[PDB]
Amino acid sequence: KYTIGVDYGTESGRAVLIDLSNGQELADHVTPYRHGVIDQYLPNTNIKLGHEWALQHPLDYVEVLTTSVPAVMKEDADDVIGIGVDFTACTMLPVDEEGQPLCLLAQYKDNPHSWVKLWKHHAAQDKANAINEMAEKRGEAFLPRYGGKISSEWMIAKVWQILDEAEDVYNRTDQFLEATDWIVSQMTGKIVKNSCTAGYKAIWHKREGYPSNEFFKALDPRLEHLTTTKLRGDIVPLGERAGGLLPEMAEKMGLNPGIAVAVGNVDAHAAVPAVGVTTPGKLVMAMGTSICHMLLGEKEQEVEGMCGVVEDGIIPGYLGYEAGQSAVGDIFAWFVKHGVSAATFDEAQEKGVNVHALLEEKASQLRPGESGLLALDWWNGNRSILVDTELSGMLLGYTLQTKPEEIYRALLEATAFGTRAIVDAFHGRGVEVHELYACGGLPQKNHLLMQIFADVTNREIKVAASKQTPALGAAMFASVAAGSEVGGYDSIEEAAKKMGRVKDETFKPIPEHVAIYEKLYQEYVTLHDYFGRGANDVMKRLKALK
Amino acid sequence: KYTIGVDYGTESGRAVLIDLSNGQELADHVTPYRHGVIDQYLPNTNIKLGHEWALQHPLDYVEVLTTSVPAVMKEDVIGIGVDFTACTMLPVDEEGQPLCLLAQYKDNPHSWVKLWKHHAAQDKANAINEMAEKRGEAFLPRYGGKISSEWMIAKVWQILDEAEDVYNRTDQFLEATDWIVSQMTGKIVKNSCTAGYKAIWHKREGYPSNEFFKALDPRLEHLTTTKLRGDIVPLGERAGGLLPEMAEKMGLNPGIAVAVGNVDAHAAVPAVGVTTPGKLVMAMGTSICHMLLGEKEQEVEGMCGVVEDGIIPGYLGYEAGQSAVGDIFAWFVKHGVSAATFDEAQEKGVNVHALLEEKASQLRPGESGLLALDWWNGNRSILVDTELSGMLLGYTLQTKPEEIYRALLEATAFGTRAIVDAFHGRGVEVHELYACGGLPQKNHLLMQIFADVTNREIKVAASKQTPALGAAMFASVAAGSEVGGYDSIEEAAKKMGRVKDETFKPIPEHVAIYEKLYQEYVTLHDYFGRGANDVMKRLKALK
Ligand SMILES: O=C(CO)[C@@H](O)[C@@H](O)CO
């Protein structure tokens, strides 16, 4: 008895058939988008794309289904009770009355604004700016729910750009859709929007709904009624049944028609249940280029600098919290490409090892505090708790003897202090954090990072055991949408007890370490506040010169 | 006519022959100290010099004279002079020979020459300052509020506290620069420079009172009139005539003028043509020694010291310094510059430092977006705090090697501005800058940044052996105008002071950007080093 989770990424999509009793995947096949990311030119044309543009081809999404789901079936029958997907969040596209992408229409095929706008599409920053300006000026209740910053990557700004720069595309649009919802509408035939994206990317709230009709009007009179027209529809919680798989699609996929299809999920949020978290007190960290911190709570609290909070946003029956750490994995990448000497590089090749690996081993010989170094993990600004892109990195404690492995550890330590700033911001507001859960590739290749993390927050850290976490998550909600009656489950908690996967070995704080780090952290907090809360804005002035 | 200048460094002494008519080097020879730097085990023995110990062998200095001077002659002279490293002392007997040369004392490491690098006397120095503070000793200010572990007193106190037998057997402690000149003339005459900057000597008031030293240790009362006794004579004064059996062994006429010993940094001032106030001389190298002249003694925050006749007779000579400048750049190449940059320099067949200067060279002030506190090795001037560390601010995912290299170059220019500004606006004015060392020769970008940050024109040393020329210039003054020399260092410099025709002038728009960056520098400089946040010290503690 299994379900299928289709994990749609930035470059490719992949299907995984997961066993509904243990959570193991016996088969997965990834289908790359044959148009990939459209950042240079529209599919086989010479219509150049402006600055900060990211687009994608709608059909590549359906092709993952008509290619990968069949392939996974090959490697077994009608014991596939359901299918679900996770998508990169706020990857929207405008569709017609029949629910098809405008980019597929004769007239619109050549207007860039008719295509899919990838999450990475940052072209609408100015609109995101205005939306935040008006919300501030107006004093809108939703503003603090997103830390006082609606991203350019999200829905409202993205549609407003279309309206302005391409009004003909706007009016032609019957409804704008998150790619996660659109994709399920192609397997089900109906449009049913999930709670995760509406909540985190479309300024939605379960109790107040969307912002006032007056709020949008004050952005552009045309935008009044947007919420009841181009963004109309019931918001339904994760795990619910979008509807049945269409027979014509079922044929193309190797699946039976009518089987349960869950409402779209988001790649990051989908990780929470895949790692067994379906209750408060446990923070989940999707760790990689940066970290997306997610946490469940029983009450709504306006945590400083959080990215968002929404009921049924992550786990039905709980408020979902999301926070973000701007740069962690990127900082280590930066340091290897621009900050580590050739000597350590030679040393690494000298012993047949990768430099990252050599740097980790050498820094693990150091005792916390031994380097005498302290850093502010702000190489790429700050999102959570400080919400300021106008901040830079700092390294302190240099002596003529400072070594690359020492400064490397400082960067590791700095990111952990950054994570702690976030965990304390929640905990100190009632949104408790007792345990840490890590998923991603970072906790795989870098054990030292996980130990510093455990030492600094003084909390036990579990690591995901699944290879394809987001996919498992999708598979999990697929079973919940299926139901107990057909072999699946009646709740994500129940589904989590048997499907959730964490590695048996966890990282535990070493009291001797937790003690040194407590002191190093206090020094970090102080500089964090000095350089980031107003006393000295030198960082901002340094940028203005650059 | 010609005089010889002998420049004794930390590992080698170099003899140079210069033309008293224009101060042009025409021959020079360098002889490395046979026993180099004694700092692990005493010469062939298992005597481990544990701790921050640094000794040296006294004959290695005379070995220099009896090698390089004869050499320079083969490859007349009116006089000779020397410039030595600052506060490299040794105890001698009534014959003026070092105790380490005595069979029954060589094994004790406290009978050897204590090199300036010797830092094992910190505590004795801490006690000095503590006592000096508790007493309100008027000399403490003259040295920026902190006497060094490298200087004479702390060193003589360590010897007493630890090897009281060496102290008692010691007839007199002497500065190497004073000792070496004694070997040439048989007369022991102590110069004002080393007595002033080290040994707490003041021209008008003299040494600190007997009570002060007594207050340190009863045994030290009278130190000033026994083990450190002696008249202090100003630079350029004739120490005596060369001894008969010294001259033949050196290949020079006996009786020639042998000027009182000089110090490498200080002797650089007249060599660059500076002999009056308003002109700051920077001997720029691994670190930087800032030297300035003035008429009225002024208290200046964080100065190393100020002494009448300490540099040029008839003036108050001020000294300030920067812990690390060249060392920071070196630390960067060795531990902070990416292999990518290393490769590029290689494929282009040029030093990585050179590539880094060129790439950094293309940026405009403020273009890097970086700011640094040049305290990798703490700071000496104006703050006088060994317990401070470096900082780098402004990193982004796109920061590049040459950008942080630019920030470091700039950080050291800011540190120098702090120094010059401490002098200026305090009475001792700085209208011009003069630079010596390798950096002025090896890094033009740094010279221009200094120009733009300090907003002062900068002239560069024209000689290749600036210190040697200085010692040589003084040698001429010590032989008078009667036999081919000068009656003063002023006249001598009017013709021997060498400065390159090409000077670095401040570029208006650059000074404006730097006036901006400097203020940011000052804010952090005060935040991290003046009391608001002592995280550097606490961070050091957890080390
Ligand atoms: O919305 C998100 C992050 O919350 C996802 O689309 C990520 O894949 C973006 O990197």
CA distance B225 to A13: 90
Q: Which two tokens stand for residue A379?
A: 């190489």
- CA atoms within a 13 Å half-sphere pointing along the CA-CB vector of A197: 30
State how far the Cα of B238 lies from the Cα of B85, in Å rounded to an integer: 20
d(CA B470, CA B271): 5
| Size of chain A in residues | 546
Please state the φ and ψ torsions of residue A260, each to the nearest 5 degrees: -55, 135
> Tokens representing B51?
């701790």
Is the CA virtual torsion B40, B42, B46, B51 positive or negative?
negative
DSSP state, B75? -
Alpha carbons B235 and B255: distance in angstroms, whole number: 19
CA distance A341 to chain B (A): 4
Beta-sheet strand order (sheet of B430-437): B305-308, B316-322, B288-294, B278-284, B430-437, B458-460
* Residue A413 main-chain phi, psi, to 5 deg: -60, -40
**First-to-last CA distance in chain A?**
59
Residue A334: list chain B partners with CB under 8 A: 397, 399
Q: Which of B328, B338, B518 would best serve as a mutation to test chain A binding (most A beta carbons within 10 A)?
A: B338
Q: Are A5 and A81 in contact (CB under 8 A)?
A: no
Using CA atoms, how far apart are residues A374 and B528, in angstroms rounded to an integer?
14
What does the DSSP 8-state code read for residue A336? I
CB contact under 8 A, B393 and A397: no
Q: Which two tokens stand for residue B463?
A: 């000689």
Beta strands (DSSP E) in A33-91 are 55-56, 80-87
The two three-digit tokens of residue A218, written as one number? 């004050």
Residue B434 Cα, gap to closest chain A Cα (Å): 27
For residue A295, CA distances in Å to A82, A283, B67 come to 27, 5, 79
Q: How far apart are CA B527 and CA B491, in angstroms?
A: 47
3-state helix, strand, coil in chain B (%, to 5): 40, 20, 40
Verify whether ligand 1 is closer than 6 Å to residue A292 (CB atom): yes
Find residue B321's DSSP bridge partners.
B289
Nearest CB neighbour to A339, from listed B336, B343, B368: B336
Which residues have a Cβ under 8 Å from the Cβ of A532 and sit 6 or more positions away? A378, A382, A386, A388, A391, A539
Strand B458-460 relative to strand B430-437, pairing = parallel
In angstroms, the CA A354 to CA A337 distance is 13
Q: Specify the 3-state DSSP secondary structure of B267.
A: coil
**Token duo for residue B371:** 């700011």
Residue B76: both structure tokens together: 């007349």
CA–CA gap between residue A462 and residue A443 (Å, rounded): 9
For B275, the token pair is 């002999």
A 10 A CB-CB count for A29 gives 19
Q: What is the number of alpha carbons within 13 Å of residue A318 lying toward its C-beta?
A: 21
Residue B338, Cα to own-chain centre: how many angstroms? 33
| DSSP per-residue string spanning A408-443 | HHHHHHHHHHHHHHHHHHHHTTT--EEEEEEEESHH
Three-state secondary structure string covering B427-453: CCCEEEEEEEECHHHHCHHHHHHHHHH
**Residue A230 tokens, joined:** 């181009």
Question: Which candidate, B335, B377, B413, places its Cα nearest to that of A397?
Answer: B377
Which of ligand 1's atoms lies nearest the C-alpha of A91?
Answer: 6
- β-sheet bridge partners, residue B392: A395, B372
| Contact of B290 with B346, CB cutoff 8 Å | no
- The secondary structure of B113-135 as a DSSP string is EE-TT--TTHHHHHHHHHHHHHH
The protein residue whose alpha carbon is closest to atom 4 in ligand 1 is A268
Q: What is the pairing mode between strands A281-287 and A433-440?
A: parallel
Dist CA B543 CA A401 (whole Å) = 13
Alpha-carbon span A504 to A494, nearest angstrom:
20
> Which chain A positions have a beta carbon within 8 Å of B395's beta carbon?
378-379, 392-395
A293 - beta bridge partners?
Answer: A285, A323
Burial of A349 from C-beta contacts in 10 A (0-12 / 13-18 / 19+): exposed
Q: CA-to-CA distance for B276 and B136, rounded, in angstroms?
A: 32
The answer to whether the CB of A482 falls within 8 A of the CB of A490 is: no
Domains of chain A: 1-275 (3.30.420.40), 276-546 (3.30.420.40)
What's the rounded Cα separation, in Å, for the pair A341 and A492? 49
Give the contacts of A273 (CB within 8 A, at least 6 positions apart). A315, A473, A476, A477, A492, A495, A496, A499, A500
Distances (CA, A) of B191 to B86, B87, B114, B155, B262: 12, 12, 18, 19, 7
What span, in angstroms and rounded, lies between the C-alpha atoms of A438 and A463? Answer: 5
**CB-count exposure of residue A406 (10 Å: 0-12, 13-18, 19+):** buried
Rounded CA separation B236/B259 (Å):
6
Tally: H helices and E strands in chain A: 19, 21
CB neighbour class for B523 (10 Å; exposed up to 12, middle 13-18, buried from 19): middle
> Rounded to whole angstroms, how far apart are CA atoms A57 and B198?
78
How do beta strands B12-19 and B2-8 pair? antiparallel
A304 Cβ inside 6 Å of ligand 1:
no
Asked if A477 and A316 count as a contact pair (C-beta separation under 8 A), the reply is no
Distance from CA of B324 to the nearest CA of A (A): 9
Find the angle CA(B393)-CA(B395)-CA(B399) to the nearest 5 degrees: 130
Place of tokens 């019957």: A174
- Determine the residue type at A47: I
* Residues preceding chain discontinuities in chain B with C to N over 2.5 Å: 75
Place of tokens 């030198």: A538
Tokens of A125: 């920053």
Closest CA to B354 of B286, B443, B436, B450: B443
Determine the Cα–Cα distance for residues B170 and B96; give it in Å rounded to an integer: 10
User: Is the Cβ–Cβ distance between A22 and A496 less than 8 Å?
Assistant: no
Distances (CA, A) of A52 to A123, A162, A390, B135: 5, 15, 19, 69
Is the minimum distance from the CB of A196 to ligand 1 under 6 angstroms? Answer: no
Write the CB contacts of A29 (distance below 8 Å, at least 6 apart in sequence). Answer: A14, A15, A67, A68, A71, A72, A75
Tell me how far apart the alpha carbons of residues B121 and B126 are, in angstroms, rounded to a whole number.
9
What's the distance, Cα to Cα, between the start and end of chain B in Å? 59
Nearest CA in chain B to A525: B535
Residue B476 in tokens: 């001429």
Report which protein residue has its CA nearest ligand 1's atom 7: A88
**CA distances to A104, B81, B185, B248, B252 from B255, in Å:** 105, 14, 9, 11, 9
Contact assessment for residue B133 and residue B209, using Cβ atoms and an 8 Å cutoff = no
CA A117 – CA B345 distance, rounded (Å): 43
Instruction: Let me know if A367 is exposed, middle or buried by CB neighbors in 10 A (0-12, 13-18, 19+).
Output: exposed
Q: Are A245 and A257 in contact (CB under 8 A)?
A: yes
Q: How far apart are CA B70 and CA B63, in angstroms?
A: 11
Does any ligand 1 atom lie closer than 6 A to the CB of residue A119? yes
Instruction: Supply the angle between the helices B176-185 and B59-74 in degrees, to the nearest 10.
Output: 60
* Angle at which helices A511-532 and A447-457 cross, to 10°: 80
Q: Are B16 and B3 in contact (CB under 8 A)?
A: no
| Other C-beta atoms lying within 10 Å of the C-beta of residue B322 | 25
> Please, are residues B294 and B277 in contact by the beta-carbon 8 Å criterion?
yes
Query: What is the spatial distance between Cα A148 and Cα A146, in angstroms, rounded to a whole number?
Result: 5
Q: How far apart are CA B503 and CA B252, in angstroms?
A: 39
CA–CA separation, A271 and A269 (whole Å): 5
Query: Can you tell me the distance from the alpha carbon of B446 to that of B287, in angstroms, rounded to the nearest whole number?
Result: 14
Q: How distant is the Cα of A157 from the closest Cα of chain B, in angstroms?
A: 26
Q: What does the block give as tokens for A182?
A: 């659109």
Q: Say how many C-beta atoms besides its own lie within 10 A of residue A290's C-beta.
A: 17
A349: left (phi over 0), alpha (psi -120 to 50) or beta: alpha
Residue A245: C-alpha distances to residues A8, A538, B319 (Å): 18, 57, 86
Q: Which two tokens stand for residue B496?
A: 């021997």
Give the residue ranges of DSSP H helices in B200-239.
210-216
To what resolution in angstroms was this structure determined? Answer: 2.3
- Maximal C-alpha separation, chain A: 71
Total residue count of chain B as it appears in this document: 543
Per-residue buried b or exposed e for B225-236, using 16+ beta carbons within 10 Å of the residue's own CB = eebbeeebbbbb
The residue whose CB lies within 8 Å of the most ligand 1 atoms, and thus the one to mutate among A118, A120, A267, A321, is A267
CA B187 to chain centre: 26
CA–CA gap between residue B27 and residue B537 (Å, rounded)? 50
Residue A174: other Cβ atoms inside 10 A: 17
DSSP A251-278: HHHTS-TT-EEE--EETTTTHHHHTT--
Is residue B256 within 8 Å of B80, Cβ to Cβ? yes
| B48, B53, B451 from B45: Cα distances, Å | 8, 16, 51
CB atoms within 10 A of CB A413: 27
CB A185 within 8 A of CB A107: no
Other Cβ atoms within 10 Å of B246 Cβ, number: 19
SS3 content of chain A, % helix, strand, coil (to 5): 40, 20, 40
Rounded to whole angstroms, the Cα distance separating A7 from A44 reads: 27
Question: And the tokens for A73?
Answer: 């079936």
With beta carbons less than 8 A apart as the criterion, state whether B304 and B144 touch: yes
Alpha carbon distance B513, B414 (integer Å): 12
Please list the alpha-helical segments (H only) found in B291-400.
326-335, 339-347, 352-361
Does ligand 1 have an atom closer than 6 angstroms to the CB of A180? no
The partner residues of A297 in beta bridges, in order of sequence, read A319
